[PDB]
Amino acid sequence: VNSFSGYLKLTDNVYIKNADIVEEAKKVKPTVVVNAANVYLKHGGGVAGALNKATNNAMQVESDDYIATNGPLKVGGSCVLSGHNLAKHCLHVVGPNVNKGEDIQLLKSAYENFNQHEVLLAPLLSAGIFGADPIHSLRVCVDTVRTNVYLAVFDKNLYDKLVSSFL
Ligand SMILES: N#Cc1c[nH]c2ncnc(Sc3c(F)cc(F)cc3F)c12
């Protein structure tokens, strides 16, 4: 039993809800919140911009030190950093950005990072400003992630479409 509330169950391990991931993280304080990161951990907009703002820029400060030490992530890769006031940990996962020409096949690799954590609160990877089809992102999620994932979908209109078209 966990503290996530109001989710629709899609599969044995994938759950979904119309919610603002920032407000959902602040309420649940999950072990792991997933950020829709880029390789530079520059959290400017989309989910990353919103998560970073909620930490009062502490996520960005931590991230800049991480990059100065380690260099950029790979597309499809991830790193674990602090969750600050939102979660115990933040798993920064880089899905391919379609508006950058990156191979959508890397989306499966990106979701594989979720399997290193038993339970996660997460957005759909590569959705929103990363330009991929959210219906496709949900399909890859369900077909790749084996651990317990609670998906927050900000757009109520998109959420209803994701539910109604789910196979
Ligand atoms: N900005 C911003 C946000 C603030 N809270 C959020 N909670 C969830 N998602 C997003 S952005 C987004 C989207 F619009 C569509 C999609 F398919 C995947 C996404 F990550 C935000």
Write the CATH fold name.
Leucine Aminopeptidase, subunit E, domain 1
Q: Which secondary-structure class do the elements indicate?
A: alpha/beta
In terms of DSSP E residues, the strand content is 15-25%
Number of helices: 6
Classified in CATH, the superfamily is Leucine Aminopeptidase, subunit E, domain 1
Bound molecules: ligand A1BKD
The tally of domains stands at 1
Report the major sheet. 4 strands, mixed
Instruction: Write down the Rg.
Output: 14 Å
> Helix content range of the residues, please?
25-40%
Level-1 CATH class name? Alpha Beta
Task: Tell me what the structure shows.
May form homohexamers. Interacts with N protein. It is a multi-pass membrane protein. This is Papain-like protease nsp3. The protein has 167 residues and is of the alpha/beta class. The chain has one domain: Leucine Aminopeptidase, subunit E, domain 1 (3-Layer(aba) Sandwich). The protein contains six helices and seven strands; from the N terminus they run ββαβααββαβαβα. The strands form two sheets. Strands 1-2-7-6 form a four-stranded mixed β-sheet, with helices on both faces. The chain has a three-stranded mixed β-sheet with strand order 3-5-4, covered by helices on one side. β1 and β2 form a beta hairpin. The longest helix has 13 residues. The protein is globular. The relative contact order is 0.21. The site of the ligand N#Cc1c[nH]c2ncnc(Sc3c(F)cc(F)cc3F)c12 has 16 residues, from α1 and α2.
What's the gist of this structure?
The protein is α/β, with parallel strands linked by helices. It contains six helices and seven strands. It has one domain: Leucine Aminopeptidase, subunit E, domain 1 (3-Layer(aba) Sandwich), CATH 3.40.220.
